[PDB]
mmCIF file of C-alpha atoms (C1' of nucleotides) in Angstrom:
data_model
loop_
_atom_site.group_PDB
_atom_site.id
_atom_site.type_symbol
_atom_site.label_atom_id
_atom_site.label_comp_id
_atom_site.label_asym_id
_atom_site.label_seq_id
_atom_site.Cartn_x
_atom_site.Cartn_y
_atom_site.Cartn_z
ATOM 1 C CA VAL A 1 -9.488 -39.322 -24.628
ATOM 2 C CA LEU A 2 -7.945 -36.093 -23.325
ATOM 3 C CA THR A 3 -5.585 -34.230 -25.664
ATOM 4 C CA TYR A 4 -3.269 -32.371 -23.308
ATOM 5 C CA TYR A 5 -1.826 -29.512 -25.352
ATOM 6 C CA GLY A 6 -1.973 -25.735 -25.545
ATOM 7 C CA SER A 7 -0.792 -22.563 -23.878
ATOM 8 C CA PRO A 8 -0.413 -22.701 -20.088
ATOM 9 C CA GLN A 9 -3.728 -21.008 -19.248
ATOM 10 C CA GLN A 10 -5.768 -23.383 -21.400
ATOM 11 C CA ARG A 11 -3.401 -26.195 -20.396
ATOM 12 C CA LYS A 12 -4.327 -25.730 -16.724
ATOM 13 C CA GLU A 13 -7.969 -25.298 -17.747
ATOM 14 C CA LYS A 14 -7.666 -28.758 -19.321
ATOM 15 C CA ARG A 15 -6.078 -29.996 -16.090
ATOM 16 C CA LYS A 16 -9.181 -28.924 -14.129
ATOM 17 C CA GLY A 17 -10.892 -32.057 -12.843
ATOM 18 C CA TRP A 18 -8.112 -34.562 -13.558
ATOM 19 C CA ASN A 19 -8.088 -35.910 -9.989
ATOM 20 C CA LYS A 20 -11.706 -37.099 -10.064
ATOM 21 C CA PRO A 21 -12.101 -40.884 -10.470
ATOM 22 C CA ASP A 22 -12.873 -41.833 -14.083
ATOM 23 C CA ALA A 23 -12.497 -38.211 -15.200
ATOM 24 C CA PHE A 24 -10.936 -39.707 -18.334
ATOM 25 C CA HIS A 25 -9.940 -43.123 -19.650
ATOM 26 C CA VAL A 26 -6.712 -42.278 -21.511
ATOM 27 C CA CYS A 27 -4.566 -39.147 -21.752
ATOM 28 C CA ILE A 28 -2.271 -38.499 -24.723
ATOM 29 C CA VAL A 29 0.574 -36.006 -24.296
ATOM 30 C CA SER A 30 3.719 -34.930 -26.135
ATOM 31 C CA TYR A 31 7.242 -35.473 -24.817
ATOM 32 C CA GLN A 32 7.840 -31.706 -24.793
ATOM 33 C CA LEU A 33 4.941 -31.256 -22.373
ATOM 34 C CA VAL A 34 6.077 -34.287 -20.352
ATOM 35 C CA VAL A 35 9.428 -32.572 -19.807
ATOM 36 C CA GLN A 36 7.564 -29.295 -19.218
ATOM 37 C CA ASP A 37 4.781 -30.525 -16.939
ATOM 38 C CA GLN A 38 6.389 -33.588 -15.286
ATOM 39 C CA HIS A 39 4.946 -32.844 -11.825
ATOM 40 C CA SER A 40 1.331 -33.139 -12.976
ATOM 41 C CA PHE A 41 1.822 -36.482 -14.713
ATOM 42 C CA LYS A 42 4.022 -37.912 -11.952
ATOM 43 C CA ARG A 43 1.477 -37.096 -9.236
ATOM 44 C CA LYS A 44 -1.254 -39.028 -11.051
ATOM 45 C CA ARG A 45 -1.100 -42.815 -11.408
ATOM 46 C CA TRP A 46 -1.200 -43.965 -14.998
ATOM 47 C CA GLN A 47 -1.791 -47.754 -14.996
ATOM 48 C CA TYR A 48 -0.610 -48.923 -18.433
ATOM 49 C CA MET A 49 1.843 -46.521 -20.091
ATOM 50 C "C1'" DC B 1 -53.112 86.084 19.954
ATOM 51 C "C1'" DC B 2 -57.108 82.035 19.595
ATOM 52 C "C1'" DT B 3 -58.574 78.434 16.886
ATOM 53 C "C1'" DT B 4 -60.267 75.454 12.529
ATOM 54 C "C1'" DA B 5 -58.702 71.856 9.576
ATOM 55 C "C1'" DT B 6 -55.055 70.990 6.162
ATOM 56 C "C1'" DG B 7 -49.955 71.923 2.525
ATOM 57 C "C1'" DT B 8 -46.125 69.865 2.271
ATOM 58 C "C1'" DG B 9 -43.563 66.325 0.305
ATOM 59 C "C1'" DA B 10 -41.071 61.136 1.951
ATOM 60 C "C1'" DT B 11 -40.687 56.786 3.468
ATOM 61 C "C1'" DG B 12 -43.472 53.243 3.952
ATOM 62 C "C1'" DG B 13 -46.287 50.015 1.846
ATOM 63 C "C1'" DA B 14 -49.388 46.796 -1.405
ATOM 64 C "C1'" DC B 15 -49.133 45.243 -5.654
ATOM 65 C "C1'" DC B 16 -47.931 42.853 -10.436
ATOM 66 C "C1'" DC B 17 -45.830 39.508 -12.386
ATOM 67 C "C1'" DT B 18 -42.408 36.477 -11.836
ATOM 68 C "C1'" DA B 19 -40.574 32.300 -11.161
ATOM 69 C "C1'" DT B 20 -41.299 28.587 -9.017
ATOM 70 C "C1'" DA B 21 -42.290 23.582 -6.421
ATOM 71 C "C1'" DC B 22 -43.423 19.687 -7.828
ATOM 72 C "C1'" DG B 23 -47.488 15.736 -10.219
ATOM 73 C "C1'" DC B 24 -45.654 12.274 -12.920
ATOM 74 C "C1'" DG B 25 -41.536 10.797 -14.894
ATOM 75 C "C1'" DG B 26 -36.363 10.204 -16.082
ATOM 76 C "C1'" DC B 27 -30.788 10.803 -15.467
ATOM 77 C "C1'" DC B 28 -28.331 10.254 -11.887
ATOM 78 C "C1'" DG B 29 -25.740 9.693 -6.907
ATOM 79 C "C1'" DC B 30 -26.227 6.426 -4.049
ATOM 80 C "C1'" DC B 31 -27.680 2.168 -0.669
ATOM 81 C "C1'" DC B 32 -27.861 -2.181 -1.609
ATOM 82 C "C1'" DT B 33 -28.986 -5.995 -3.915
ATOM 83 C "C1'" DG B 34 -27.417 -8.993 -7.201
ATOM 84 C "C1'" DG B 35 -25.071 -12.199 -10.043
ATOM 85 C "C1'" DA B 36 -21.108 -13.997 -12.431
ATOM 86 C "C1'" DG B 37 -16.832 -14.888 -11.978
ATOM 87 C "C1'" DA B 38 -11.850 -13.632 -11.105
ATOM 88 C "C1'" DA B 39 -8.911 -13.889 -8.274
ATOM 89 C "C1'" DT B 40 -7.156 -15.786 -3.229
ATOM 90 C "C1'" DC B 41 -7.287 -18.924 1.127
ATOM 91 C "C1'" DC B 42 -5.884 -23.357 3.428
ATOM 92 C "C1'" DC B 43 -5.185 -28.696 3.303
ATOM 93 C "C1'" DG B 44 -4.127 -32.023 1.827
ATOM 94 C "C1'" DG B 45 -1.554 -35.331 -0.956
ATOM 95 C "C1'" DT B 46 2.046 -36.511 -3.173
ATOM 96 C "C1'" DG B 47 7.178 -37.549 -4.806
ATOM 97 C "C1'" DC B 48 11.663 -35.419 -4.755
ATOM 98 C "C1'" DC B 49 16.982 -34.214 -2.727
ATOM 99 C "C1'" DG B 50 18.835 -31.553 0.491
ATOM 100 C "C1'" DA B 51 19.891 -30.685 5.797
ATOM 101 C "C1'" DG B 52 22.025 -32.354 8.941
ATOM 102 C "C1'" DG B 53 23.918 -36.253 11.039
ATOM 103 C "C1'" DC B 54 27.443 -39.412 11.325
ATOM 104 C "C1'" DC B 55 32.500 -40.796 11.016
ATOM 105 C "C1'" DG B 56 38.165 -40.120 9.874
ATOM 106 C "C1'" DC B 57 41.307 -37.658 10.999
ATOM 107 C "C1'" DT B 58 44.704 -33.494 11.445
ATOM 108 C "C1'" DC B 59 46.419 -29.310 12.665
ATOM 109 C "C1'" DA B 60 45.793 -25.658 15.623
ATOM 110 C "C1'" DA B 61 43.708 -24.483 20.437
ATOM 111 C "C1'" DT B 62 45.600 -25.320 24.715
ATOM 112 C "C1'" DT B 63 49.297 -25.821 28.062
ATOM 113 C "C1'" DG B 64 53.501 -24.575 31.330
ATOM 114 C "C1'" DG B 65 57.558 -21.651 31.241
ATOM 115 C "C1'" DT B 66 60.306 -17.355 30.228
ATOM 116 C "C1'" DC B 67 61.439 -13.064 29.305
ATOM 117 C "C1'" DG B 68 60.663 -7.995 29.021
ATOM 118 C "C1'" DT B 69 58.589 -3.684 28.320
ATOM 119 C "C1'" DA B 70 53.506 -1.214 27.961
ATOM 120 C "C1'" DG B 71 50.094 0.400 31.333
ATOM 121 C "C1'" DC B 72 49.317 1.825 35.384
ATOM 122 C "C1'" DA B 73 49.800 4.865 39.569
ATOM 123 C "C1'" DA B 74 50.803 8.737 41.575
ATOM 124 C "C1'" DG B 75 51.803 13.224 41.409
ATOM 125 C "C1'" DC B 76 54.110 17.480 39.908
ATOM 126 C "C1'" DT B 77 52.519 21.624 37.625
ATOM 127 C "C1'" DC B 78 50.416 24.905 34.915
#
DNA sequence: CCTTATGTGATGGACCCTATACGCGGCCGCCCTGGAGAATCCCGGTGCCGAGGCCGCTCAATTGGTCGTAGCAAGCTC
């Protein structure tokens, strides 16, 4: 489980490695960051939402 | 005047002691070596929404005619 929250520098530090297969099983994120960071989530494919 | 051998009185020199290079070692400038890492480079790799293409159509660019006076050609002259 990846908890995607924090200030942008640590936020992008948490992004590091997201593209690798099986880097994580589930990601949990808040709607504020979804409206903030939409590009990152939209680029990845998220199976069951 | 001839004729020994040295007085006269300084500039020229050897010396005392000074202070120094450096054996072994360190601070430091520096070559460079060295790592960690803090950026920056280029290539995807993707999903978005505008560039630009297509069509409907209208009004103004184009046309042929007319009128007339602004630019042109001497060319005089100062």
